[PDB]
Amino acid sequence: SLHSPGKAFRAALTKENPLQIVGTINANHALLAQRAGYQAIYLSGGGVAAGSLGLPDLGISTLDDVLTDIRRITDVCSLPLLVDADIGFGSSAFNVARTVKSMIKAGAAGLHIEDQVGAKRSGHRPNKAIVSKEEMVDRIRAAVDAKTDPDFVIMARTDALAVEGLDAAIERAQAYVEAGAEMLFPEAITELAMYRQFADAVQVPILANITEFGATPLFTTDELRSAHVAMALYPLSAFRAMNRAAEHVYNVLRQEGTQKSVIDTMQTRNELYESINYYQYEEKLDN
Amino acid sequence: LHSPGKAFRAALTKENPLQIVGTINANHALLAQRAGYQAIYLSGGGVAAGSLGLPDLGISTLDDVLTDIRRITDVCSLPLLVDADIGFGSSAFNVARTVKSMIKAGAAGLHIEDQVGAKRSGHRPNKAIVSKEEMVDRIRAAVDAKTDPDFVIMARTDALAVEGLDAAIERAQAYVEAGAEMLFPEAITELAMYRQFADAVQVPILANITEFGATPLFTTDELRSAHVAMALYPLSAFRAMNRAAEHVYNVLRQEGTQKSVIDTMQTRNELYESINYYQYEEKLDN
Amino acid sequence: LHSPGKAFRAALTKENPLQIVGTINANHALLAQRAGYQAIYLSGGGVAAGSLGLPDLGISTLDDVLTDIRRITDVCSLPLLVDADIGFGSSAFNVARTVKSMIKAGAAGLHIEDQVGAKRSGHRPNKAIVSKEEMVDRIRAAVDAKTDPDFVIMARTDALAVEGLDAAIERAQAYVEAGAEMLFPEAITELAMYRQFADAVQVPILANITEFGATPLFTTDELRSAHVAMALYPLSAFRAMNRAAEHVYNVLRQEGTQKSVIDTMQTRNELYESINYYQYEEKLDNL
Amino acid sequence: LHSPGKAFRAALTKENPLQIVGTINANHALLAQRAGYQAIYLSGGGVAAGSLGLPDLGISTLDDVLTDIRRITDVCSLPLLVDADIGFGSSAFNVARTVKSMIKAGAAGLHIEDQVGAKRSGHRPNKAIVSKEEMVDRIRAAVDAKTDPDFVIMARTDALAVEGLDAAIERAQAYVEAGAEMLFPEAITELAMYRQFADAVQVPILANITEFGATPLFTTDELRSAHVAMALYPLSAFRAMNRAAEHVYNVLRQEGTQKSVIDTMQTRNELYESINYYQYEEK
Ligand SMILES: [Mg+2]
Ligand SMILES: [Mg+2]
Ligand SMILES: [Mg+2]
């Protein structure tokens, strides 16, 4: 009996409510998240683009850019990884299927696909365009049919709220779930009551994207639990703090000609080694 | 056709010592460029510990490094110096393939060290190094492989802690004699030593000012007085980024919200300016 | 620094028409070089069917192609023309990244076409070609992305078979005006037709002389009389290699030994001479 | 969840000896499957010479091999045995990462050999091998790294040409004792030698029936009589494919047309059938 990351994700959902899922920009951070106690992690599409590629989150990253990060993370971290698969990386069902099979093989526990048109953008940006309900239903059907591991999770994300309104978005959500979506990700929700409306309407686990500096308030896990949201996602939180800290080191070093004044803000060598189990490896070499 | 190696050599001429900062990923390379740096570095310890979440013990492969080189140089135009450990392989063919692949991936130069196969950080105890002759062969193979004459082949020696200063300097002389264009005397403990290496080899000397190791935190003024050509800060940004990430993860887990650490975060606008986001979005909307 | 694109342009002035053969992998690129060819080709159909064992229906990713470009150009010095389909993405950003990535990978040039998604690949006759304006946008994005001025941006049009000769010529003129440096008109069946395109655009014209299709197997003499600048044989060696491989598999399975097909095999020495084996091994023996 | 290694082991019990053919790329893996084979092989000499156009001298990287494993196993369901040379690195950490990475890539098993660093074909002269103790360490590292219990760890020994039959058999016994699940005695020159290895280790034995080397072209009946469980043909199709391609290139260059060699080519309809083309288009 082989281990299923998808089965581990589903199990995590039953043990934590809402299940906190944090984005992990790279393998090192996945280990840090695990050491912090999280039971599930996330590979942000915006993070692969802005972090790994230094590019805008506008459909520029490819399937392989993402697979590279999935392998890096899952090769060392045992926590189930939910992956942002944007629109499936292609214009047809064959592309969606290749995406699902490849991510399962790379080690992911699940993925979400959204209803945006080709060159997608952040759900917290204006002027987004979405495909017809029927088109997304076909994306979803193709994804579910491609599952090689029955416990792998296929989540549907809808960006329809800001575009067509709440009722239209709920209607799409119901159609997406009827089409096979196993969990729902209603993006950029502005009021807590909306999560409850979605939850009651589709009756499958609901994910709340609590990302910073967007259209969504910073809801607490208590508030989210009261609206019956199954998981709380913090997609780029650590990434944002890491960038400010790195920027600070770069500026100080440039202005002062030494990093002495920011040593206090750095993870120590020992803390790094502890994080990656360094001593156990070096001891083996020494012997 | 633009040569990154040529740009690196040029940077050396305009700044002395030339500050070179490690960039863990493409995003940070852009932040380093915006901070004014003229050259950047791809740390082997960072590819291992950061990109792979593994110890810096010769576990990373040439391709793990090539992936990060392309990601960084595809978006950042600053010359990138790359840590190539011992050449990724048992023979001169592996060293040559490493050199040609890194040049093609967009690097400006690389350094190869004299450690045995499963190398370790120059600041760790119990290092093992190959014979002077064996290292000379690795350097000869690397130099002969250059497809871009301006690409830089830098030699690193870890012999100070293993054989002493005089032995380390003798190796450095042999390495440069064999074709190494720049020298990286690892884990120096006293400022005066940099001057001795500089005088002995007559090629640019790089001082590795990494934290929590055997080397004091020398300032650029101090390094300049010792005739150091380059001041390297390999993982400085990475160490701060890790502490900050850990803080966010801990607070979110304990508090059930990130409200209390919002002030420690780069804002969305700052991120967008960093990656030239608005230029791309404007094109799409038009 | 050597420019593959500059080498391709040079080969065009020394041979007319310039024979360009598809090379399915690095080994065959070396065989082509030994046979005397001055330029080679990375077929999109070959990357799909050969490297991935899949149909040429928009399933391959940019990275699948880049891997083959690096393998071939890392060892073979001949200029490599690459099939870049529609740019591997839905926007001008994807086209630009494809161009820059292929240049870095070592290619001498590429051709981009005017189909919608993989609709023409799927043989759909209606609404399968983008508007002239949309293709001009792809071309301008490709040309502006050139990091090496000598890299070649060729335009391929799949319109003759669906819109007629007049429309295909009109598209071709608009494409060349937008920046296309050479033209690849597909589905031509008459020599006179090649001549018409040549006079209409006044840039080098490529004739696709693939087997088992509508196009007759024109000779280089015939093509020269029609003002064709280059003759492409995209999968020729690949087709013969597959029949030979299948034969070995069949004989081995029927007989329990490969004794009877040894005479159809490249000998070990022939392989060694092709990859310069002995010069490498001797260096190892003399350490 | 399906385990490729479990499938490989099952294939052994259903075919005696099990014919394993080298598949240079995903397309040929499908050709092998369509031809009736039950197991396939990813040759290290093929990744080097074919995918990279380079000598089989330890120049290929783990990544070059992983790419080919994913391409083949993403489309072909047959269990794939992979040539892992010496583990791709200088330490047991590298051997362990190779094992884990190949399992994730989709392989059914792999073989690791006892050569020193920059290895060479087992049919080449002057090869060098590590101590029995060092090989034992590589095998222990490999077996302990298995994330799929049914993944197969095969040990290959190049000792016959260097130290003789008895020393090669002694090493083979130490390797199996260390955990090797199957054995690959390379470049055997006499049929009877296979029976000796078979009797000495009690695990499945693989015979490498490659062309133009030190091993006679033994038939599957001969191999079965010597208690050989697997018959490997690592580059057979590749060699024929190369001659065929060379012929096309030469004829086309000399004649200015490929008309005279059309009869040596797989047709487009045959190509489409081998990759299930029309099955795709319709959807
Ligand atoms: Mg996203
Ligand atoms: Mg290092
Ligand atoms: Mg081999």
Short mmCIF file of C-alpha atoms and ligand atoms in Angstrom, two decimals, chain B residues 41 44-45 56 83 85 111 113 119 156, ligand 2:
data_model
loop_
_atom_site.label_atom_id
_atom_site.label_comp_id
_atom_site.label_asym_id
_atom_site.label_seq_id
_atom_site.Cartn_x
_atom_site.Cartn_y
_atom_site.Cartn_z
CA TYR B 41 25.88 35.44 -6.65
CA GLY B 44 25.64 26.48 -3.64
CA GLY B 45 24.65 26.36 0.01
CA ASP B 56 25.20 21.71 1.58
CA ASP B 83 29.14 28.38 -7.04
CA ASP B 85 31.31 23.17 -6.07
CA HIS B 111 34.21 29.05 -8.90
CA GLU B 113 37.02 24.34 -5.18
CA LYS B 119 32.17 18.72 -0.06
CA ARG B 156 38.53 28.44 -4.45
MG MG E 2 29.14 26.68 -1.66
#
